[PDB]
Amino acid sequence: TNIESAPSLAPMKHYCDVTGLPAPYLDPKTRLRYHNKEIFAMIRNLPQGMGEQFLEARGAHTVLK
């Protein structure tokens, strides 16, 4: 009862999380999937407190305790 939800085990196609386009590579500083160099520019000069909100929208933010 209520433990019939099931996870998966399959390769996931990872998309961008700034835009919705398919994105093939992430970052070391902020760990954001991104499409091209314009989105990389907007990632590396975004004001602080939002680079964590993108991972909040995607999930696995892991905020401090």
């Binding site: 500083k29 602080q48 892991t62 401090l64 305790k65």
Partner: protein, 91 residues
Amino acid sequence: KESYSVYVYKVLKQVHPDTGISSKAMGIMNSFVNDIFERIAGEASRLAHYNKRSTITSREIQTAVRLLLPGELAKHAVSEGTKAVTKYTSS
């Protein structure tokens, strides 16, 4: 008679492996460590007493670091601290 020597040495031999440091310079670096410790801890204590809290959490240390260290220094410090606390939590 406790000193952050050991650790200054481990960091040195990690960042410039064949370089040593003099006894006087070790003294100065240990003083640096103590000073920064004191400043951050104290600002954190003040923030706690000002918000009527009685505990210095990760979030106090973070905000202390953002008040104390300038610009890029502050940003990078916040980053390192967050990374460390995350790894600790994971383990």
